[PDB]
RNA sequence: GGUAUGGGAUGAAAGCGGUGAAGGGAAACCGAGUUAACCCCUAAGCC
């Protein structure tokens, strides 16, 4: 896996944070791409950053994973591009989404960065 | 008067697009549509 993948995210845990996505894109506020997402970030924004382990080059999303640290923001990995984007509600993959205002996700979003605080290890 | 290189509508079993479309901007900022015939609006420039 690259090496901006920092750990191993199960399948149920990495269906839930896609779960979140398409919840919060109809009920809450979210940032989808990578520089809508960054921003998410740097601004303190994003309760929820997610990002697909399929990006090449891995440079274009190699600075989430440290950036999010820094900000106290949780992030989680997911295996499909493509299959964020659709989960974003657009018609083209997304490297990176950042959920702003979960919605009805809110509780899922949680659950979400507890067991990702765990993962970060 | 003609004329779109400007637009509106349309935009597919077609092309492109969150790895950033189109449009605006010096940049920051923008952040999901868009590409072309026909139809419709406009006529700066050109005839
Ligand atoms: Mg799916
Ligand atoms: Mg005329
Ligand atoms: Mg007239
Ligand atoms: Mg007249
Ligand atoms: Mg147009
Ligand atoms: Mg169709
Ligand atoms: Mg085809
Ligand atoms: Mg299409
Ligand atoms: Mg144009
Ligand atoms: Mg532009
Ligand atoms: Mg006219
Ligand atoms: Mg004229
Ligand atoms: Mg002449």
Same mark, same amino acid.
């Given at each position: ?38 921003? /998410?970030?740097?601004?303190?924004? #994003?309760?929820? *950053?997610? $990002?697909? @382990? ?6 274009? =999303? ?25 989960? /974003?509600?657009?018609?083209?993959? #997304?490297?990176? *989404?950042? $959920?702003? @205002? ?6 899922? =979003? ?12």
């Amino acid at each position: 896996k690259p090496s901006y993948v920092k750990f191993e995210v199960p399948k149920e845990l990495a269906e839930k944070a896609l779960q979140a996505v398409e919840i919060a894109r109809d009920t809450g506020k979210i940032r989808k791409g990578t520089n809508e997402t960054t921003k /998410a970030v740097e601004r303190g924004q #994003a309760k929820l *950053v997610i $990002i697909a @382990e399929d990006v090449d080059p891995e440079e274009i =999303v190699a600075h989430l994973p440290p950036l999010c640290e820094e900000k106290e923001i949780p992030y989680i990995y997911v295996p499909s591009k493509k299959e964020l984007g659709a989960a /974003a509600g657009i018609e083209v993959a #997304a490297a990176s *989404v950042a $959920i702003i @205002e979960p919605g009805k996700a809110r509780d899922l =979003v949680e659950e979400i960065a507890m067991k990702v605080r765990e993962l970060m290890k």
